[PDB]
């Protein structure tokens, strides 16, 4: 039983999803005027709050809530510690809607107790290529293609209820109130990811990580150990030797991205992302926002040959609190973001990402097996983690697809 999810416009079982052939809406069509004007009722001790993401103190409140109460892994070894600067970046992209950031505070003392964030995204989410094929053989092309145009929808992230308030059914109210504010803007679909299984993903992929600072990494789980390394003499030396990387990028032509690279980066990224079934469409302002280097937050490099950008990669920083281990309390992780390769194999481009991250002091590089991320796992010594990222739509029927048909990176 899902007392909440059974009431929502999502496919209810894997079986139902396995039946889906064309992209399209689940719900009755509705209009903005059908949607309540007033926020969803909540207990009189609580209030709704729309944080001002331009206010340092509002970003700090969100930061603290997530630092202490956001996502942990299954064994509670790590909890994400998104930084304030990271939050301001992720929550405030071009044309963001301040009303879509939704918080619940205790009225008496203004303690933040819960948060959910929506940002706008323009997403391709029409019927996948493999079904557009079944549709032709069968004579139904126009129907299969009806929703091919990129849609301006909502991307949901940072859902978080304070640990003191867990299992009190607060998450459904947050989700209902966000849905109301997005629908009041004449938006009827959302996309979201989670590490938990809910009804019902259209895709799921494993996490993969690449050790950059193995001495620290093995210590968090906790020398001896790894099992396979004990079996010889200088095991720490063998671990360091296995994961060592060059001090400097190998690709001549590599350099940090600059504002004048925006058009070229936009073009080579959009030609690449277009090949996938689900993927975002970015304007120049969105490329500038999500890809231009920002200290501590997002790191982007291009390969430039004869003043032409031919390849690029990006990664962003999310440190995690290390939970029990006393010595090291933060793990500095670099996450593979968007990239495009036209002049060199993908593994050669991403080796430079690992070199740069390592040189900048990151301990590990992490990613999900979306995009073409599988194509460099073995050669660059990534290993599968224990997590799986599931992709979801709200109010959108969508066939099941492989994660290598997904091009949307969620922060
Ligand atoms: C058109 C616009 C639409 C916009 C909205 C689109 C939908 C957006 C949907 C949100 C996408 C978020 C994307 C991310 O940010 S995924 C990251 C989510 N955050 C965390 O994991 C942080 C740590 N955990 C918590 O803060 C809480 O445990 C949360 C908040 C997750 C649950 O709070 P709590 O543990 O106190 O439980 P409750 O008693 O209040 O509520 C229980 C109900 O909640 C359902 N539940 C549990 N986990 C999730 C989850 N990750 N997504 C959606 N639903 C979830 C659960 O199945 C149950 O429903 P049902 O089984 O009874 O039916
Ligand atoms: C948009 N948005 C929504 C929330 C979604 C939930 C997170 C998915 C769960 C989820 C994410 C990732 C993993 S993991 O297998 O990579 N383990 C973790 C690692 N590594 C493990 C060993 C090397 C470093 C390092 C740091 C971590 N920090 C926190 C949690 C796990 C972490 C395991 C589980 C993530 C993305």
Distance CA 373, CA 219 (A): 27
Specify whether the CB–CB gap between 393 and 202 falls below 8 A: yes
Cα dist from 242 to 210, 222, 223, whole Å: 11, 18, 16
Beta bridge partners of 304: 309
Active site residues: 411
State the resolution, in angstroms.
1.6
Q: Which residues line ligand 2 (CB under 6 A)?
A: 71, 73, 78, 80, 157, 193-195, 207, 209, 320, 331, 333, 364, 366, 385-387, 389, 410
Distance CA 309, CA 265 (A): 7
Using CA positions, which residue lies closest to atom 5 of ligand 2?
A: 194
**Closest of 83, 158, 80 to residue 321, by C-alpha:** 80
Other CB atoms within a 10 A radius of the CB of residue 224 amount to 10
**Closest of 331, 361, 336 to residue 79, by C-alpha:** 331
Domain spans in the chain, listed from the N-terminal domain onward: 1-411
Chain centroid to CA 411: 3
Say which CATH architecture domain 1-411 belongs to: 3-Layer(aba) Sandwich (3.40)
Output the six-digit token pair for 165: 């308030």
Burial code (b: 16+ CB inside 10 Å, e: under 16) for 66-75 equals: bbebbbebee
Residues 6+ apart with CB under 8 A from 185: 32, 97, 99, 100
53 three-state secondary structure: coil
Does 254 belong to an annotated binding site? no
**Closest of 369, 395, 25, 5 to residue 203, by C-alpha:** 369
Cα dist from 112 to 104, 168, 172, 176, 349, whole Å: 6, 16, 17, 18, 42
Distance CA 220, CA 78 (A): 10
Residues 6+ apart with CB under 8 A from 28: none
Using CA positions, which residue lies closest to atom 10 of ligand 2?
A: 387
């Amino acid at each position: 039983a899902h007392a909440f999810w059974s009431t929502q416009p999502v496919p209810q079982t894997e079986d139902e999803t396995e039946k889906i052939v064309f992209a399209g809406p689940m719900d009755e069509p509705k209009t903005v005027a059908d949607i309540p004007e007033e926020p969803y009722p909540i207990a009189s001790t609580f209030e709704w709050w729309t944080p001002n993401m331009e206010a340092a103190d509002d970003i700090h409140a969100i930061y603290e809530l997530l630092r202490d109460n956001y996502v942990e892994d299954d064994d509670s070894m790590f909890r994400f510690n998104y930084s304030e600067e990271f939050l301001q970046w992720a929550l405030c992209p071009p044309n963001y809607i301040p009303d879509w950031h939704v918080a619940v505070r205790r009225k008496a003392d203004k303690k933040l107790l819960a948060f959910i964030a929506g940002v706008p995204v323009t997403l391709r989410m029409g019927t996948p290529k493999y079904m557009k094929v079944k549709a032709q053989e069968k004579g139904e092309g126009e129907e299969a293609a009806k929703y091919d145009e990129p849609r301006h929808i909502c991307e949901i992230n940072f859902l978080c209820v304070h640990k003191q308030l867990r299992e009190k059914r607060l998450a459904p109210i947050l989700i209902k109130e966000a849905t109301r504010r997005v629908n009041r803007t004449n938006v009827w679909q959302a996309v979201y990811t989670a590490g938990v299984l809910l009804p019902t993903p259209y895709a799921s992929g494993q996490y993969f990580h690449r050790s950059l600072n193995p001495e620290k990494l093995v210590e968090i789980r906790f020398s001896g150990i790894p099992a396979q390394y004990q079996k010889f003499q200088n095991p720490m030396a063998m671990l360091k030797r296995n994961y060592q990387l060059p001090s400097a990028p190998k690709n001549s032509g590599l350099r940090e991205m600059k504002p004048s690279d925006v058009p070229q980066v936009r073009r080579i990224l959009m030609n690449y992302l277009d090949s996938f079934d689900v993927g975002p469409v970015f304007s120049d302002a969105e490329i500038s926002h999500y890809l231009l280097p920002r200290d501590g937050v997002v790191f982007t490099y291009v390969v430039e040959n004869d003043k032409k950008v031919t390849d690029f990669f990006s990664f962003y920083r999310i440190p995690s609190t290390v939970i029990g281990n006393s010595n090291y309390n933060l793990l500095n992780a670099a996450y593979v973001h968007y990239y495009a390769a036209t002049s060199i194999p993908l593994h050669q481009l991403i080796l430079d990402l690992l070199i740069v991250a390592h040189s900048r002091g990151f301990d590990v590089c992490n990613m999900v097996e979306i995009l073409d991320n599988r194509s460099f796992v073995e050669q660059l010594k990534f290993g599968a983690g224990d997590g799986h990222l599931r992709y979801y739509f709200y109010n959108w029927a969508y066939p099941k697809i492989k994660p290598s048909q997904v091009a949307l990176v969620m922060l």
